[PDB]
């Protein structure tokens, strides 16, 4: 069983906890406690490989540098109806680059809440940013579970592309 250490980063309220809960439990949580920062496991077969995913759901206030230093891949999450959350991505990416001392860190940009009407961040802005960074862009809904598996599996794939597993 190969382990993958994943970290989910991004602003409060973008749906980090809700995505993580969906992947594991196939349940959408309407409110999940914003101060619960924890680590979750999921055994999944991806491309004929039994993976044990170790997902840190970041939370709390602004041991951290430990998961950040050793995490193999990062989900950088904004909400499509939260312009500030999107603007914040630059900071998360910068800081991840710093800790890894690398422009090439396995990462996926996730634009969540795709079910909500009238996005304030359009797919073009999100694609432009992902392209600049050399990373995939995936739109999700934790509410409906759409793109949720795609985000996490694509991250596992970006990790493999970077390093032997
Ligand atoms: C509602 C509760 C919830 O859901 N939360 C998730 C939550 C968001 C706030 N968080 C962070 N915020 C800020 N800074 C600010 C100031 C100005 N900007 C523009 C935006 C935020 N920096 C952060 C940061 F640098 C890192 C980080 C990175 C990337 C890389 C290596 C690292 N080593 N050590 C920290 C760190 C991490 Cl991991 C989080 C925050 C932490 C975790 C709280
Ligand atoms: N419509 C909708 N609401 C969502 C989605 N993801 C999360 N939410 C809601 O947005 C709020 C913040 O979600 P949460 O998962 O706690 O975000 P976090 O602060 O980044 O962990 C919660 O009320 C969720 O129910 C989504 O895809 N769609
Ligand atoms: Mg949370």
What does this structure look like?
The termini are close together. 36% of the residues lie in helices and 25% in strands. It is built from six helices and six strands; from the N terminus they run E-H-E-E-H-E-H-H-E-H-E-H. The chain has helices spanning 16-25, 64-70, 83-87, 89-100, 123-133, 148-162; strands spanning 2-9, 38-46, 49-57, 73-79, 107-112, 137-139. It has one domain: 3-Layer(aba) Sandwich (Rossmann fold). It is of the alpha/beta class. The protein has a six-stranded mixed beta sheet, sandwiched between helices. It is globular and about 40 Å long. Bound molecules: ligand IQC, guanosine-5'-diphosphate and magnesium ion. The PDB classes it as oncoprotein/inhibitor. The entry lists the keywords ONCOPROTEIN-inhibitor complex. The assembly is monomeric. The entry is titled "KRas G12C in complex with Compound 5c". The protein is Isoform 2B of GTPase KRas.
CATH homologous superfamily identity: P-loop containing nucleotide triphosphate hydrolases
Shape: globular
The helical percent reads 25-40%
Distance between the termini: 10 Å
Instruction: Just give the CATH class.
Output: Alpha Beta
Pairing-aware structural class of the strands and helices? alpha/beta
> In this structure, how is the largest beta sheet organized?
6 strands, mixed
Residue fraction in strands: 25-35%
Radius of gyration from CA coordinates: 15 Å
Number of helices: 6
PDB class: oncoprotein/inhibitor
Keywords: ONCOPROTEIN-inhibitor complex
Assembly: monomeric
Entry title: KRas G12C in complex with Compound 5c
């Amino acid at each position: 069983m190969t382990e993958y250490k994943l970290v989910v980063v991004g602003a409060c309220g973008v749906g980090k906890s809700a995505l993580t809960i969906q992947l594991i439990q196939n349940h959408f949580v309407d409110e999940y406690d914003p101060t619960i920062e924890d680590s979750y496991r999921k055994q999944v077969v991806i491309d004929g490989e039994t993976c044990l995913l170790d997902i840190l759901d970041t939370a709390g206030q602004e041991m951290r540098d430990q998961y950040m230093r050793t995490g193999e891949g990062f989900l950088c999450v904004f909400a499509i109806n939260n312009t500030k959350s999107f603007e914040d991505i630059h900071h998360y990416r910068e800081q991840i680059k710093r800790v890894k001392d690398s422009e090439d860190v396995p990462m996926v940009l996730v634009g969540n809440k795709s079910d909500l009407p009238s996005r304030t961040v359009d797919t073009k802005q999100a694609q432009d940013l992902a392209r600049s960074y050399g990373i995939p862009f995936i739109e999700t809904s934790a509410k409906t579970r759409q793109g949720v598996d795609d985000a996490f599996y694509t991250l596992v794939r970006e990790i493999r592309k970077h390093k032997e597993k």
